Enzyme design. Structure first.
Site, PDB file in Angstrom:
ATOM      1  N   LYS A  16       7.016   2.747 -12.615  1.00  0.00           N
ATOM      2  CA  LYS A  16       6.012   3.733 -12.213  1.00  0.00           C
ATOM      3  C   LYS A  16       6.216   5.036 -12.971  1.00  0.00           C
ATOM      4  O   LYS A  16       5.249   5.699 -13.338  1.00  0.00           O
ATOM      5  CB  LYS A  16       6.066   3.998 -10.703  1.00  0.00           C
ATOM      6  CG  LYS A  16       5.731   2.802  -9.833  1.00  0.00           C
ATOM      7  CD  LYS A  16       6.014   3.109  -8.376  1.00  0.00           C
ATOM      8  CE  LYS A  16       5.887   1.867  -7.523  1.00  0.00           C
ATOM      9  NZ  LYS A  16       6.219   2.127  -6.103  1.00  0.00           N
ATOM     10  N   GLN A  76       8.868   5.278  -1.376  1.00  0.00           N
ATOM     11  CA  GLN A  76       9.167   3.929  -1.831  1.00  0.00           C
ATOM     12  C   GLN A  76       9.634   3.091  -0.651  1.00  0.00           C
ATOM     13  O   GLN A  76      10.473   3.522   0.133  1.00  0.00           O
ATOM     14  CB  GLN A  76      10.257   3.965  -2.902  1.00  0.00           C
ATOM     15  CG  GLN A  76      10.557   2.622  -3.537  1.00  0.00           C
ATOM     16  CD  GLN A  76       9.393   2.071  -4.340  1.00  0.00           C
ATOM     17  OE1 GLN A  76       8.631   2.823  -4.961  1.00  0.00           O
ATOM     18  NE2 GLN A  76       9.251   0.749  -4.338  1.00  0.00           N
ATOM     19  N   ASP A  92      -0.695   6.280  -2.085  1.00  0.00           N
ATOM     20  CA  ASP A  92      -0.382   4.898  -1.735  1.00  0.00           C
ATOM     21  C   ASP A  92      -1.333   4.394  -0.640  1.00  0.00           C
ATOM     22  O   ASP A  92      -1.359   3.202  -0.339  1.00  0.00           O
ATOM     23  CB  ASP A  92       1.075   4.766  -1.265  1.00  0.00           C
ATOM     24  CG  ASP A  92       1.960   4.057  -2.278  1.00  0.00           C
ATOM     25  OD1 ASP A  92       1.505   3.792  -3.413  1.00  0.00           O
ATOM     26  OD2 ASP A  92       3.126   3.762  -1.930  1.00  0.00           O
TER      27      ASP A  92
HETATM   28  N1  LIG Z   1       7.334  -3.296  -0.028  1.00  0.00           N
HETATM   29  C1  LIG Z   1       7.223  -3.329  -1.365  1.00  0.00           C
HETATM   30  N2  LIG Z   1       7.295  -4.549  -2.025  1.00  0.00           N
HETATM   31  C2  LIG Z   1       7.189  -4.626  -3.361  1.00  0.00           C
HETATM   32  O1  LIG Z   1       7.250  -5.705  -3.956  1.00  0.00           O
HETATM   33  C3  LIG Z   1       6.985  -3.319  -4.122  1.00  0.00           C
HETATM   34  C4  LIG Z   1       6.927  -2.140  -3.434  1.00  0.00           C
HETATM   35  N3  LIG Z   1       7.040  -2.131  -2.058  1.00  0.00           N
HETATM   36  N4  LIG Z   1       6.763  -0.952  -4.107  1.00  0.00           N
HETATM   37  C5  LIG Z   1       6.688  -0.809  -5.484  1.00  0.00           C
HETATM   38  C6  LIG Z   1       6.111  -2.045  -6.158  1.00  0.00           C
HETATM   39  C7  LIG Z   1       6.164  -1.988  -7.695  1.00  0.00           C
HETATM   40  C8  LIG Z   1       4.980  -2.729  -8.296  1.00  0.00           C
HETATM   41  C9  LIG Z   1       5.236  -3.308  -9.623  1.00  0.00           C
HETATM   42  C10 LIG Z   1       5.357  -4.681  -9.773  1.00  0.00           C
HETATM   43  C11 LIG Z   1       5.540  -5.228 -11.043  1.00  0.00           C
HETATM   44  C12 LIG Z   1       5.603  -4.399 -12.151  1.00  0.00           C
HETATM   45  C13 LIG Z   1       5.721  -4.979 -13.560  1.00  0.00           C
HETATM   46  O2  LIG Z   1       5.379  -4.300 -14.531  1.00  0.00           O
HETATM   47  N5  LIG Z   1       5.938  -6.292 -13.648  1.00  0.00           N
HETATM   48  C14 LIG Z   1       5.960  -7.005 -14.932  1.00  0.00           C
HETATM   49  C15 LIG Z   1       7.298  -7.744 -15.107  1.00  0.00           C
HETATM   50  C16 LIG Z   1       8.531  -6.835 -15.107  1.00  0.00           C
HETATM   51  C17 LIG Z   1       9.828  -7.612 -15.251  1.00  0.00           C
HETATM   52  O3  LIG Z   1      10.349  -8.093 -14.220  1.00  0.00           O
HETATM   53  O4  LIG Z   1      10.331  -7.745 -16.391  1.00  0.00           O
HETATM   54  C18 LIG Z   1       4.806  -8.005 -15.045  1.00  0.00           C
HETATM   55  O5  LIG Z   1       4.329  -8.242 -16.179  1.00  0.00           O
HETATM   56  O6  LIG Z   1       4.394  -8.541 -13.992  1.00  0.00           O
HETATM   57  C19 LIG Z   1       5.495  -3.027 -11.991  1.00  0.00           C
HETATM   58  C20 LIG Z   1       5.313  -2.486 -10.725  1.00  0.00           C
HETATM   59  C21 LIG Z   1       6.787  -3.319  -5.648  1.00  0.00           C
END
Ligand SMILES: Nc1nc(O)c2c(n1)NC[C@@H](CCc1ccc(C(=O)N[C@@H](CCC(=O)O)C(=O)O)cc1)C2
Ligand SMILES: NC(=O)c1ccc[n+]([C@@H]2O[C@H](COP(=O)([O-])OP(=O)(O)OC[C@H]3O[C@@H](n4cnc5c(N)ncnc54)[C@H](OP(=O)(O)O)[C@@H]3O)[C@@H](O)[C@H]2O)c1
Ligand SMILES: NC(=O)c1ccc[n+]([C@@H]2O[C@H](COP(=O)([O-])OP(=O)(O)OC[C@H]3O[C@@H](n4cnc5c(N)ncnc54)[C@H](OP(=O)(O)O)[C@@H]3O)[C@@H](O)[C@H]2O)c1
Lengths: 295, 285
Positions: free
Chosen positions: B55, B99, B124
């Site tokens: 983020k 968070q 949020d």
């Molecule tokens: N209660 C709660 N549960 C959660 O799962 C989260 C949360 N709060 N707050 C913050 C949130 C963050 C959201 C998020 C999810 C994935 C990514 C992201 O960029 N994912 C990449 C893969 C990253 C990796 O693991 O290498 C993608 O391409 O999906 C960024 C933000 C998760």
């Protein structure tokens, strides 16, 4: 094997009688405690005067001190706001409501007025904060709008567990439809919400073991649509001229009763189903507020 | 043969680029003005740390000033309330978030903490005020949770209108399921919400022209249950990483489907940035 009838008039009489007993016992358990309700009215509408007098009367019989504040048509928004702020601050008032619609010569933002009500005193349960709690599952302490609260009560009077069942709610208004979905969801039923943009409504309605209809469309939901053995809750109050009636008019629901009563296992008649339940529900919400303050 | 892939990383990349240009122009209109976002964390969860970093990284690249406050595990609800009040009063902070989940050794009522946040800065959309507005159809005045927002955006990328469709949301949490139902409902779909107490879940899922799954149970929703030609949105992040839907099977039945990873995840952060740029723009207005 026609559907059993859910007598709202009788069930509500029971509820009000029990609430009277509870109120009597609260006052004896805590000497000096006085459950208090307040109704804020703006203007002098004939219908509002009638509804208000019915609420006040039910409150006095249960032992709840009911205060009626009637402001003139000349009232402005800032004045109405001043009263809401004073009612919020008044520690002797446990719950209050603003009777709608407002009757004033001036322009008044109804939504801002309603939303100035302290969530802990919002017995009609229409503030956004309260709607937000009910929608997310805070059923243990939030307030529930009188109509859908009366519907859940009628559904529970059947003795059939709600959890696991598929409930269909036709209508999604702030007053009925939306909070009705909320009650059903948090009581663990799988809920499907329908509205004016729903395609094949008949096929959707036919999937509900529990059906709550609140559309304002007189007898639109045909008996053929009803799922065999379903619990049917009809919130409809539609007027239709009928010279064979004492006052020359009949009240029909949003469900075609005569044909639906042959399919369902439980059904609310109109008139005499959901309607008589509402004032009792407001009285129950009032007592709840009083008890949460007292604790 | 398989369903079209809804590439959340490419779509979020386009949204971020758009927001970046918008932020750059805002600064050219009012030099010195800087949209600011703040992230409050309690504890030191490894997953929360990585989520926050992502983020923070997206904010920097868009031009938003992001502040990260990390409180120790010994933090009390009372102390968290002091930072929240500080953030509500700090005029330079246009939007902030707590968070979740809170990582503390003491009991802290999460709803009370979240509800202390000023609704104008609740990017949020977790306050009871914003939830209540979304829940009743008042979309003019509220912040919608970032996950449901990203999902809606993904559904629109299919180009298929939502109105009239029978939608199915598997899951009802405050963060995803409940607000997701609301977004679909107010977008005129007929919505069915399923949960852990749902009987015959396979029969419920089969009715969905639009299917959003947010349960947290690894590949529990079978491809057999998918309605041929359905739009499948998978919010699941389960540990290899997998979604809440059996992808290989569901892809042969769906018309459009979100992969995991690279599906809903990226879109979620893009939408958070969008709500942040929005809270900065409502402040200048
Ligand atoms: N209660 C709660 N549960 C959660 O799962 C989260 C949360 N709060 N707050 C913050 C949130 C963050 C959201 C998020 C999810 C994935 C990514 C992201 O960029 N994912 C990449 C893969 C990253 C990796 O693991 O290498 C993608 O391409 O999906 C960024 C933000 C998760
Ligand atoms: N017992 C009581 O004292 C009590 C209290 C309150 C209400 N009621 C009764 O309940 C009824 C409903 O009130 P309401 O507040 O919900 O009113 P409303 O605001 O007009 O609600 C109508 C809802 O039903 C939907 N709808 C309209 N026509 C429909 C159709 N043909 N097919 C499927 N859905 C349809 C609308 O969808 P959209 O959102 O798309 O417009 C809307 O959500 C009224 O008849 C009223 O008399 C009784
Ligand atoms: N992309 C993003 O960045 C993003 C952000 C946040 C979350 N997510 C993901 O979304 C998922 C769900 O999050 P959450 O906060 O909603 O989780 P949660 O608090 O555990 O909620 C899960 C919900 O699904 C229901 N459920 C559990 N097992 C089920 C089953 N077997 N069948 C049908 N329903 C079942 C539960 O019902 P009950 O209420 O009855 O228990 C509950 O409502 C997680 O995998 C998370 O990774 C993604």
């Amino acid at each position: 094997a026609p559907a059993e009838i859910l007598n709202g008039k009788e069930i509500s009489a029971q509820i009000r009688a029990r609430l009277k007993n509870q109120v009597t016992q609260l006052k004896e358990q805590v000497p000096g405690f006085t459950p208090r309700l307040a109704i804020l009215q703006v203007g002098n509408r004939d219908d509002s005067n009638l509804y208000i007098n019915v609420k006040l009367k039910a409150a006095e019989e249960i032992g709840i001190k009911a205060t009626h504040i009637k402001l003139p048509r000349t009232t402005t928004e800032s004045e109405v706001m001043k009263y809401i702020t004073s009612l919020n601050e008044d520690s002797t008032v446990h719950g209050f409501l603003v009777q709608l619609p407002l009757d004033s010569e001036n322009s008044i933002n109804t939504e801002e007025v309603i939303n100035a009500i302290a969530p802990e005193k919002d017995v009609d349960g229409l503030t956004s904060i309260n709607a937000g709690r009910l929608a997310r599952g805070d059923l243990n302490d939030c307030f529930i709008p009188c109509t859908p609260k009366g519907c859940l009560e009628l559904i529970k009077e059947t003795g059939v567990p709600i959890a696991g069942r598929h409930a269909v709610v036709v209508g999604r208004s702030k007053i009925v439809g939306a909070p009705m979905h909320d009650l059903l969801l948090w009581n663990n039923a799988t809920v499907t919400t329908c509205h004016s943009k729903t395609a094949h409504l008949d096929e959707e309605v036919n999937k509900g073991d529990i059906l709550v209809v609140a559309t304002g469309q007189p007898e639109m939901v045909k008996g053929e649509w009803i799922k065999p053995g379903a619990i049917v809750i009809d919130c409809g109050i539609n007027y239709v001229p009928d010279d064979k009636k004492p006052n020359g008019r009949k009240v029909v629901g949003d469900v075609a009763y005569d044909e639906a009563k042959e399919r369902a296992s439980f059904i609310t008649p109109v008139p005499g189903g959901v309607g008589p339940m509402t004032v009792a529900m407001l009285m129950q919400s009032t007592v709840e507020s009083a008890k949460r303050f007292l604790e």
